Design a protein around this nucleic acid. Structure first.
Lengths: 331, 328
DNA sequence: TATCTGCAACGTTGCAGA
DNA sequence: TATCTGCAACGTTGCAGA
């Protein structure tokens, strides 16, 4: 009962080839014949059998999203998926998820994809300054887009958050509060935005004329129980920071836990600026000055890039950077 | 130059059918040619064309996960995905995702799958007492599994959290907390576990002999921007309940926000027990009494159930219910 | 017997004609 | 010329035959 090109050709009494050539934009076929086929196609509900189109022509009509299984607790990764799927909804693409179970495994799904040819484009995250997957797919000619930017001299489609702007805008608000010494929970040295964050913070500390409390012992992906204990004894030592800037809201939740374990009130004792992947943090402590990283917006703009790239628009167009916006609920 | 059965057959040089039949361990092909075919196959190293197979046989080797586009903010839906994929990683299945965005559009994706025959199994959530998707796939002989249970008299593979057990246990510890008035946050009467929650909870209050504050005014699906004032307006009242139970940590977060604006100290005045899809609430509130629903645990056995049903195992083997745990 | 083998076909499209 | 169309093949397996 499912309609096929054969099924259409029979009713029309046309040639299967005519139908195939009719459904697709072609000068070869006649206007009336075309419109006949485009109309009958719409009425019966004909959707091309994919396995058939994939067997003959390379087209997989599949977009692969690769995910590291270890993720930020509050990374609301699900929002990214919905951003993409919303975009893909108009088109013939399907979204497959292919995760890897550690940074050690980071190239294995990508070689899988290129080797079996099971995708028309790939979406990747956790970009490093010199990232091998970026070079692998560019040199193997695979359309892709990255959540993050790269410092390797390759122009590729991407959308990132302007964390350089974020850090610079982050302490200006701490300066506005009057806070004189600031610490940053910087991201891992391996990832690209680490240096993005540190640039904004370094120019931020310079231009606002405020001193910078430093911390080298901990990073965002350092464990949350461990962040809790660390957070507690700063405030216990004679020198405590006046300001705190966090790049991840999940690491953020563990830092406050130690502070009130230490027994300090935010707002009055220390004020915190933090990024959030969904607006949730002011419910628990509205004191926190929050910036929203709209990630399903990232989800939607990653999708739009990769599609344009699958068509064949050049990479330098397809690049985009999200600017910080300051949360509804923040002071 | 990607190797195909023809490529192997050319090299060996055997018959394509011999090559195919060797790799599927078959009785026809002789022991020595099989290790020849399997040794060369591994070395080059051959992957069957998914398209070539899918066109030739019905099997699509794809699992469709259907997701409500609107989900509780703290649903850690991402955890479930990983739970699912862990199971499929050993297998030949891929996981494709299929979303809808309107409640009426509840079944639009489901027929897309059937209409297209673009999946070997399907996963769905947000189950209703008589849900149209559940019998639709049951009558179309389409293998599927649900996150939740259904009251339509149809037996199907599922995995749910024992909310009836949880609700009864919620009332026990509020007795332990000493609180004499109890409130219950329930899902919309739209959903099935709504009665599961209220049955365990109302049975709980009879046995613990302590009474339930009514609070029929709000449900979990009420905006967190609205459940707020309710929170502040309730404790800012002539009578405040001594104990409160939440089914959603997403609603737990907003209600306490109202509680602290009005100024009630949790722990001392009011004690709260709440459901959790991942351990995040005691980082946020150390005194709140937390129970963990491991959702990627849900994810793996929804996966494990659906596989069994696709091979054709009977539906009732496939049913599972997780008992609640009170955390670390 | 053991052990191998071609044909035919799923739905689509490129190419060479009608 | 201007539209139309059959043949073949993409890779795979069930099947009969040897």
């Amino acid at each position: 009962e499912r309609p096929t090109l054969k099924t259409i050709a029979y009713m029309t009494g046309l040639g299967i080839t005519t139908v195939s050539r009719a459904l697709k934009d072609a000068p070869d076929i006649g206007a009336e014949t075309k419109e006949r086929v485009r109309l009958i196609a719409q009425q019966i509900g004909y959707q091309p059998n994919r396995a058939g189109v994939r067997l003959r022509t390379g087209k997989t009509n599949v977009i692969a999203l690769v995910l590291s299984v270890d993720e930020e607790l509050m990374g609301f990764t699900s929002q990214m998926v919905f951003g993409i799927t919303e975009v893909l909804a108009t088109t013939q693409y399907h979204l497959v998820v292919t995760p890897h179970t550690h940074a050690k495994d980071s190239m294995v799904p990508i070689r899988y994809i290129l080797e079996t040819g099971s995708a028309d484009g790939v979406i990747i995250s956790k970009i490093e300054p010199n990232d091998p997957r970026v070079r692998f797919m560019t040199e193997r000619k695979m359309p892709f887009v990255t959540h993050g930017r790269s410092d390797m001299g390759i122009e590729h489609a991407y959308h990132d958050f302007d964390n350089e702007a974020y850090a610079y805008e982050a302490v200006e608000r701490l300066a506005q509060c009057g806070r004189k010494r600031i610490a940053i929970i910087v991201p891992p040295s391996r990832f690209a935005f680490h240096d993005h964050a540190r640039k904004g913070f370094t120019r931020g500390i310079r231009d606002f004329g405020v001193s910078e409390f430093p911390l080298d012992a901990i990073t965002i992906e350092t464990p949350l129980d461990k962040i809790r204990d660390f957070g507690k004894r700063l405030m216990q030592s004679d020198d405590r920071p006046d300001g705190i800037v966090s790049i991840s809201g999940s690491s953020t939740i563990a830092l406050v836990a130690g502070f009130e374990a230490a027994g300090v009130r935010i707002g009055k004792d220390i004020d915190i600026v933090s990024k959030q992947s969904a607006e949730f943090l002011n419910w628990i402590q509205p004191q926190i000055h929050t910036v929203n990283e709209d990630i399903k917006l990232a989800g939607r703009e990653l999708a739009k890039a990769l599609l344009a790239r699958i068509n064949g628009a050049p990479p330098e167009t397809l690049q985009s950077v999200s600017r910080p916006v300051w949360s509804s609920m923040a002071p």
